[PDB]
């Protein structure tokens, strides 16, 4: 009796007549990559294939999982929306994902503060689980350390169906000097909760290239932990404002 989602199945070693089986256990302990499952001829072993297939069925489900907006409302967040209406239309039109709809400009101008030094934007992106697992652990201690010894922190909000180039339009509307965007990257096989931060100094839709952004990726419990990743963004926000330089233009 074996669950393919269980911790016993994850740690399963399938190499048949090992040279050194104690080394195999430490190798499997070293990584979350699917090592040490052995082979049948040159093919995967059956259990490794089955666990692969199990994990892929879960991984498909995570891409079109969506946040409840009553989760978003009870985070204390403004929910705002891009041009896209569907999850199906998000997956197939990146261009509508990186500009806001007609009421989204209006809600942000009327309800959010104008000309902040640092502006925080949250999007579901390609993984809902990335922002929904990590939120309580990222957002308060980030939005501490910006206001807690800095200056004018902008009011945070949630973009639905966002691509990262939408933060160019957001930076222009609010007049924002640094725009930072926490967003769900594409789901992997084994894990859905990986968060990225994309960050421009003073973005402009007709000017800022992708290389002008600073990326910090792989934010979760199995990457850089969301507590201490909030510290490294606050530090980056300081370094950005000081040298007026965005991403590839940052020193050293």
């Amino acid at each position: 009796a074996l669950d393919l989602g269980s911790a016993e199945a994850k740690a399963w070693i399938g190499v048949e007549n090992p040279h050194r089986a104690d080394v195999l256990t430490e190798l499997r302990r070293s990584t979350v990559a699917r090592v040490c499952t052995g082979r049948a001829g040159p093919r995967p072993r059956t259990q490794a294939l089955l666990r692969f297939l199990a994990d892929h069925s879960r991984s498909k489900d995570t891409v079109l999982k969506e946040v409840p907006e009553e989760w978003v409302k009870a985070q204390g967040l403004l929910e705002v929306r891009s041009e896209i209406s569907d999850k199906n239309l998000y997956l197939t039109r990146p261009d509508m994902g990186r500009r806001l709809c007609a009421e989204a400009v209006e809600a942000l101008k009327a309800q959010c503060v104008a000309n902040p030094d640092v502006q925080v934007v949250i999007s579901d992106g390609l993984s809902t689980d990335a922002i929904t697992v990590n939120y309580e652990e990222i957002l308060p201690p980030l939005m501490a350390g910006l206001k807690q010894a800095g200056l004018k922190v902008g009011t945070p909000f949630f973009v639905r169906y966002g691509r990262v180039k939408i933060e160019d339009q957001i930076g222009e509307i609010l007049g924002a000097k640094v725009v930072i965007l926490l967003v769900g990257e594409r789901p992997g096989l084994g894990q859905s909760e990986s968060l990225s931060c994309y960050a421009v100094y003073s973005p402009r839709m007709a000017t800022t290239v992708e290389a002008d952004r600073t990326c910090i990726s792989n934010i979760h419990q199995g990457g850089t932990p969301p507590v201490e990743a909030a510290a490294v963004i606050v530090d980056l926000a300081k370094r950005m404002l000081e040298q007026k330089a965005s991403g590839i233009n940052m020193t050293r």
Partner: protein, 453 residues
């Protein structure tokens, strides 16, 4: 030229070469998204017809982004052998397709003919090729390069070991290396995409890779696939240099998007010749893929297949050790399903080989695309028969960090033993010394990373 044909009584008129190139593509998601795709099956075939009647001069003298505005266009145009071009400029694209596919055309015939091409002409030939045309066409155009291994010899098949980790944990990287080597993976390169783009981290990952290389005297190359600027720094300040990597795009706007100048690529070649631990003459490594130019706003109304060919025109200038497309790396926006990803991979490989670069393929998909692991295994075998120079290897193909699925270590061993292909001759000799390979075949002791302990 004719920009016009009639099909079944109906006149199909096209505005320019760029529209003909775009609409002659097999249906894909990204061409529809770019707005450049054919309206119907009938108009697709009409565009294929018009393209086939267009001459080599017709397409060479209409690049999709103009000479004066784009440094990639200039580079592709300046690289043309004009004597080779003058021989073929009045060939129709139909005649060039039949010339490439002909058994009476040798590898040495194509060696000269390809020097009279531009990337747009390469693209044009691929657009009127069926799937078996792309496979048989690519197979009779081998491209051979050498670092510390020789890649691309007919009857051989190589593999990048891609030992990626979420933290760049050097224990997790090493574990995946010992695993890949035990399947005979890593004759193309041992190549890590790092998490952090800084010099001491790059140096530590390179020390981890070359720790294994030096201990076991492996004939191969290391690479850390950060930005080319940080690699050069790392190597200048004393990290082991193997292959030097850059992601490229097929326009100046697209290069600007990636934060690359052409002069960095010249510097990489100069740093390689000064520093790098490479016995042969090739030491650069590019990665490409359909949709990157679209994503950047940098396609200028061209289709993704034409823009991807322009990558191979750019890469060719620098005579790299290896190039691969990363075929379904981005998602269903640009290539939607099994059929489209297979077709792209076959196109990309054919166009790479026709451009005369050492072309492999990351046979891969994403989890928000309509694809699975059986897609990877279909494509990897088709491309292997096309004489694809290399694929990736990861443990079951699960990247824990780039969030996609490529091909397994298993798959390279499968392909080699299915098709009776060998590794790189230098690396194969090492595998035989380790007792991992006999006669192109995994031994009993193979597939077991504790063999190295």
């Amino acid at each position: 030229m004719k920009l016009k044909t009639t099909l079944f009584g109906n006149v199909y008129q096209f505005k320019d070469v760029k529209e003909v190139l775009a609409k002659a593509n097999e249906l894909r998601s990204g061409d529809v998204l770019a707005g450049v795709a054919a309206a119907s099956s009938q108009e697709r075939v009409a565009a294929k017809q018009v393209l086939s009647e267009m001459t080599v001069a017709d397409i060479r003298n209409n690049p999709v982004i103009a000479y004066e505005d784009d440094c990639v266009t200039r580079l592709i145009q300046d690289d043309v052998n004009e004597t080779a071009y003058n021989q073929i400029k009045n060939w129709s694209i139909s005649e060039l397709r039949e010339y490439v596919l002909s058994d009476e055309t040798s590898v040495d015939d194509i060696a000269f003919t390809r020097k009279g091409l531009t990337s747009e002409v390469v693209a044009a030939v691929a657009k009127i090729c069926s799937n078996a045309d792309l496979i048989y066409g690519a197979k009779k155009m081998p491209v051979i390069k050498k670092a510390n291994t020789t890649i691309g010899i007919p009857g051989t098949f190589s593999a990048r070991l891609q030992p990626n980790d979420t933290r760049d944990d050097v224990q997790s990287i090493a574990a995946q290396i010992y695993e890949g080597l035990s399947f005979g993976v890593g004759d193309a390169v041992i190549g890590v995409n790092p998490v952090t783009d800084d010099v001491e981290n790059l140096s530590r990952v390179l020390d981890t890779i070359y720790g294994v290389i030096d201990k076991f005297n492996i004939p191969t190359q290391g690479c850390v696939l950060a930005h080319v600027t940080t690699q050069i720094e790392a190597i200048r300040r004393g990290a082991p240099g193997g292959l030097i990597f850059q992601s490229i795009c097929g326009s100046e706007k697209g290069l600007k998007e990636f934060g690359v100048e052409l002069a960095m690529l010249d510097e990489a070649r100069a740093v390689g010749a000064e520093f790098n631990r490479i016995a042969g003459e090739n030491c650069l490594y590019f990665e490409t893929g359909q949709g990157s130019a679209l994503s950047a706003g940098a396609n200028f109304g061209a289709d993704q297949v034409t823009m991807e060919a322009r990558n191979y025109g750019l890469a060719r200038h620098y005579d790299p050790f290896i190039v691969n497309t990363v075929v379904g790396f981005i998602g269903p926006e640009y290539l939607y399903n099994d059929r489209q990803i297979i077709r792209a991979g076959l196109e990309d490989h054919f166009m790479g080989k026709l451009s005369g670069i050492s072309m492999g393929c990351d046979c891969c998909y994403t989890n928000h695309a309509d694809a699975d692991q059986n897609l990877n295994e279909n494509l990897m075998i088709l491309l292997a028969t096309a004489g694809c120079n290399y694929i990736m290897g990861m443990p079951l193909g699960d990247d824990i960090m780039l969030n996609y699925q490529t091909t397994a270590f298993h798959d390279t061993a499968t392909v080699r033993q299915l098709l009776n292909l060998r590794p790189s001759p230098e690396f194969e000799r090492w595998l035989e010394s380790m007792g991992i390979m006999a006669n192109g075949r995994l031994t009993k002791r193979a597939g077991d990373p504790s063999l190295f302990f």
